[PDB]
Amino acid sequence: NLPARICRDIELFHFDIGPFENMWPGIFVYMIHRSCGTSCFELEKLCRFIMSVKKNYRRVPYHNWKHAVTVAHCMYAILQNNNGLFTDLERKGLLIACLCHDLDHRGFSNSYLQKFDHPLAALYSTSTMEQHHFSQTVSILQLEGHNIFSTLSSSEYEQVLEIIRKAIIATDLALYFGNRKQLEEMYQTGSLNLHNQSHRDRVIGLMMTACDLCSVTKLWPVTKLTANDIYAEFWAEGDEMKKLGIQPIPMMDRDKRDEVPQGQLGFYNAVAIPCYTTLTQILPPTEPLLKACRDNLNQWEKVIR
């Protein structure tokens, strides 16, 4: 069962899941049963599914099993503070999408895969690794005793898989810029309609981005340490770009590491702040994410001074 401190702290947007890996499944089970009912998901099947998902994450610095559960927690907190907006089915799908969205991630971007001429880039031209993460999710669901959705109708099964596919694909940050621009225009013209499936899919897309980027919404000591893991992958990809004979972008070039604070500023300005600002406009109870993001922007500004 869940320790008292976790029981309380799990409801905070800036919760950190801790360094004990064997506790994470229980944290995920608690979140999905609190969000979607103890009804649905036979415990045994869910646990089996969870353990296989874990097994298919890699021991990379950032896009690892810990990241999956952390992204799932952020989604939990959004859903807990916006009661009555999403269906039981959506809530289950979104939480599973979050757990699975980075399956088999090797710590390299779609861009590197393209430049490498990796076989995945020939299979899936755009959102290469995300299409792969979704395929891996379906493959795991298809394993004996792993169908956590087995009690759903055929129609609901197809429904939930589609929710998951769109949610995983939306974690391709390249898609975020256009998604956010459209949502913002709809907000400002007052035409956003959550009963319109296309608008709804967009809002879910932004939620997925907001959860994926959530390191910037933790408290500063957590944000700062997490940035170390983020750069560890970027710099490893930059080394690999150099090995292909391509000069990496500055963000991936360890020779430019002294410019991290300026790079962070750019990221918060162009990506993080607009993302959480748009999210708060649509879902006001997500305000704490924006506040924490702004606090971290200030800390980065403080580093530069």
Q: Which stretch binds Mg ion (CB under 5 A): 24-32, 163-171, 176-184, 262-270?
A: 163-171
| Residue 195 known to bind ligand | no
DSSP of the chain: ---HHHHHHTTSTT----S-GGGHHHHHHHHHHHHH-SSSS-HHHHHHHHHHHHHHS---SSSSHHHHHHHHHHHHHHHHTSTTSS-HHHHHHHHHHHHHTTTT--S--HHHHHHHT-HHHHH-SSSHHHHHHHHHHHHHHTSTT--TTTTS-HHHHHHHHHHHHHHHHHT-HHHHHHHHHHHHHHHHHT---TTSHHHHHHHHHHHHHHHHTGGGGS-HHHHHHHHHHHHHHHHHHHHHHHHHT-PPPGGG-GGGGGGHHHHHHHHIIIIIHHHHHHHHHH-GGGHHHHHHHHHHHHHHHHHH-
> Which positions from 158 through 187 interact with ligand PFW, judged by CB under 6 A?
173
233 is a contact residue toward Zn ion (CB under 5 A): no
Shortest distance, position 28 Cβ to ligand PFW, whole Å: 22
Q: How many Å apart are CA 66 and CA 64, to the nearest integer?
A: 5
The answer to whether residue 199 is catalytic is no
| Closer of 148 and 275 to ligand PFW (Cβ) | 275
> Which positions from 251 through 280 interact with ligand PFW, judged by CB under 6 A?
251, 256, 259-260, 263-264, 266-267, 270-271
| Residue 239 known to bind ligand | no
| Residue 118 known to bind ligand | no
| Residue 201 known to bind ligand | no
Question: Which partner from the list Zn ion, ligand PFW, Mg ion, none does 137 bind, CB cut-off 5 to 8 Å by kind?
Answer: none
| Residue 101 known to bind ligand | yes
Question: Which partner from the list ligand PFW, Mg ion, Zn ion, none does 274 bind, CB cut-off 5 to 8 Å by kind?
Answer: none
Q: How many Å apart are CA 205 and CA 252, to the nearest integer?
A: 26
| Closer of 161 and 168 to Zn ion (Cβ) | 168
Selected binder of Zn ion within 212, 229, 237, 253 (CB under 5 A): 212
């998902």: which residue's tokens? 53
Shortest distance, position 129 Cβ to Mg ion, whole Å: 7
Shortest distance, position 229 Cβ to Mg ion, whole Å: 13
Total number of residues binding Zn ion (CB under 5 A)? 2
> Which positions from 182 through 201 interact with Zn ion, judged by CB under 5 A?
none
């980027």: which residue's tokens? 213
Catalytic residue among 14, 33, 63, 199: 63
Residue nearest to ligand PFW (CB): 263
Selected binder of Mg ion within 27, 75, 102, 248 (CB under 5 A): 102
Tally Cβ neighbours within 10 Å of residue 34.
15
Where do contacts with Zn ion occur on this chain (CB under 5 A)?
102, 212
Q: Which positions are annotated as active-site residues?
A: 63
Positions in the binding site for ligand PFW (CB under 6 A): 173, 213, 215-216, 227, 230, 250-251, 256, 259-260, 263-264, 266-267, 270-271
